[PDB]
Amino acid sequence: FEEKTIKTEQIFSGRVVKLQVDDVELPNGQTSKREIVRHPGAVAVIAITNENKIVMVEQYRKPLEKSIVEIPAGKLEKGEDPRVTALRELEEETGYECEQMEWLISFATSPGFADEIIHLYVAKGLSKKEFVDLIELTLDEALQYIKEKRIYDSKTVIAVQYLQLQEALKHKLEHHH
Amino acid sequence: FEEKTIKTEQIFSGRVVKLQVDDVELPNGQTSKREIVRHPGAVAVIAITNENKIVMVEQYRKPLEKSIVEIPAGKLEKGEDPRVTALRELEEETGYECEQMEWLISFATSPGFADEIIHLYVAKGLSKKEFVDLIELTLDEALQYIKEKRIYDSKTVIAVQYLQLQEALKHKLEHHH
């Protein structure tokens, strides 16, 4: 099943948001329009300190009219290596360097209207290389921020769940025959 | 910290996407613009059958140019009860009724430019009340769809992680003194 684009019209081209509408041909020969936001995507980092606290930053989010606590993340620049962007983000936003930075998962944030993709990485073995909006939380503190709706966006909820699973699964070992 | 809106201009008002730009006053008296997509939000359902399979639907997502496998979800209508919308979605999209439908968490999908909120519910005790794009997966099958990037959006990754945690934590019991 595929919706072939016959024509694209740009509605808006901003510093964050590009909006376009595609005239598309349905497999039945009917035609219709698809509103599409284009977004360069983002890299995000789950950084877990040697005290096992997850590193976070408080950001003001104008669309929500509130500040929320998030894992660090940066815009992916044109043709840039996401892992390189990830490492720049750890240092610039938290002032931490790591020993490893490894890709965990990639996902769309809202594929019903946007093509934005998040690339989620895990940084382990942190040490420092100033930071007013920097917050380090224990796992239990993070779960409490979720209860409080201070943590409140997809990618940060996924990171907290990941830390949770890493604790809950740390003895797992399957031996098949 | 707050960005007061001085004025709003509507750029576009569609069937899915509303785009506006706010002129806002920074706390320092500087001014700037914020591009904001308005979205009514969505309710989504984690439905776990009595065989412990999670219920999913394959959707074509034009912004990604591909079909992906997702938990069921529906637009929240103006002033509607999200739990009522959730239950309508279970029946209409999967043909399942449940015994309980309970709110798990709410979150923003991309708060850097959109106000879209997802309300995530869990349905337990399913029985049927036709479905070409309906898929039921074991937990291990779901993890494999993630490996394959067939599962590929925030809310479905959160649901899979939840099923994972529910298995991994099923013996937990803390007794404090």
UniProtKB/Swiss-Prot annotation, chains A, B:
Its cofactor is Mg(2+). It is an enzyme of class 3 (hydrolase). InterPro entries: NDP_pyrophosphatase (IPR004385), NUDIX_hydrolase-like_dom_sf (IPR015797), NUDIX_hydrolase_CS (IPR020084), NUDIX_hydrolase_dom (IPR000086). GO terms for cellular component: cytosol. GO terms for biological process: nucleoside phosphate metabolic process; ribose phosphate metabolic process. PROSITE patterns: NUDIX, NUDIX_BOX. Its EC number is 3.-.-.-. The keyword Hydrolase applies. It holds the Pfam family NUDIX. Keywords: Hydrolase. The keyword Cell wall biogenesis/degradation does not apply. One of its GO terms (molecular function) is hydrolase activity. NCBIfam families: nudix-type nucleoside diphosphatase, YffH/AdpP family (TIGR00052). Homodimer. Belongs to the Nudix hydrolase family. Involved in the activation of the NAD-dependent methanol dehydrogenase (MDH). MDH activation by Act involves hydrolytic removal of the nicotinamide mononucleotide (NMN) moiety of the NAD cofactor, changing its ping-pong type of reaction mechanism into a ternary complex reaction mechanism. It requires the presence of magnesium ions and is also able to use ADP-ribose. This is Methanol dehydrogenase activator. It comes from Bacillus methanolicus. The lineage of its organism: Bacteria, Bacillati, Bacillota, Bacilli, Bacillales.
